[PDB]
């Protein structure tokens, strides 16, 4: 018999992104080659099968730094991290291959789906 | 020029609630009289003006335990904590006064709004 506030989930995510921008309560740095990205472990797990696996691990759950595979593109990661915190994906001709490869590695199935559909339309 | 995934914010919130149920990465206990509630500080701040103020405070941000005012009803808090993590509010005749008072204390304006409208309809 609950009532539901339609905009609540979006409002929560907007405030989680504000916390990220102000670097409040971030508990991990994701290292992608020469670049560093601060984030909240809980948001990373909620968006990514890879981070869900990493941060449920009894040893990795306590790490303050996570290094990604050297093949991972920093811009692709940046675009996906922005998506995690906003629901918005900056998908462009010049970045689609890097975004899809990063989304496959991060196990972000809905992003992989759409990248596949956008590539198929151009061939 | 971004594209947007409609269900992303709801999917994130569902996974944050799964983390709460499994007690993964919870970093605070909220004490309401004889009852204890584990939560994520980031979600509490994102939903409540009171917790936003508390956890941006340079001393309170590091506390693992927060005690609420003894006038706060544990069931009212429980209903509001469930709302924070699900967008669903279990608003009933028997709990509406406690829910509205707790929402005023927690500074959850949309919940206060609706409690006011539901009470006005019954008078």
């Amino acid at each position: 018999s609950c009532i539901q506030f339609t905009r609540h989930a979006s409002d929560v995510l907007l405030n989680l992104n504000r916390l990220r921008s102000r670097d409040i309560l971030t508990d991990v740095v994701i290292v992608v080659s020469r670049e560093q990205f601060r984030a909240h472990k809980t948001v990373l797990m909620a968006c990514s099968g890879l981070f869900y696996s990493i941060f449920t691990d009894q040893l990795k759950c306590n790490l303050s730094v996570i290094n990604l595979d050297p093949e991972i593109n920093p811009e692709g990661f940046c675009i996906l991290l922005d998506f995690m915190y906003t629901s918005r994906l900056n998908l462009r001709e010049g970045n689609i291959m890097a975004v899809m490869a990063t989304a496959m590695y991060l196990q972000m199935e809905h992003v992989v789906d759409t990248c596949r559909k956008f590539i198929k339309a151009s061939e | 020029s971004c594209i947007q995934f409609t269900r992303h914010a709801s999917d994130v919130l569902l996974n944050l609630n799964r983390l709460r149920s499994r007690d993964i990465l919870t970093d605070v206990v909220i004490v309401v009289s004889r009852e204890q509630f584990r939560a994520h500080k980031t979600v509490l701040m994102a939903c409540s003006g009171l917790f936003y103020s508390i956890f941006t405070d340079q001393l309170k941000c590091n506390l693992s335990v927060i005690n609420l005012d003894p006038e706060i009803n544990p069931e009212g808090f429980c209903i509001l904590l469930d709302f924070m993590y699900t967008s669903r509010l279990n608003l009933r005749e028997g709990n509406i006064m406690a829910v509205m008072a707790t929402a005023m204390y927690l500074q959850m304006e949309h919940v206060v709004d609706t409690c006011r409208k539901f009470i006005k309809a019954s008078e």
């Binding site: 609950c2 009532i3 539901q4 506030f5 339609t6 | 669903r88 509010l89 949309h110 609706t114």
Partner: peptide, 4 residues
Amino acid sequence: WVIP
């Protein structure tokens, strides 16, 4: 607010 809605009836879900």
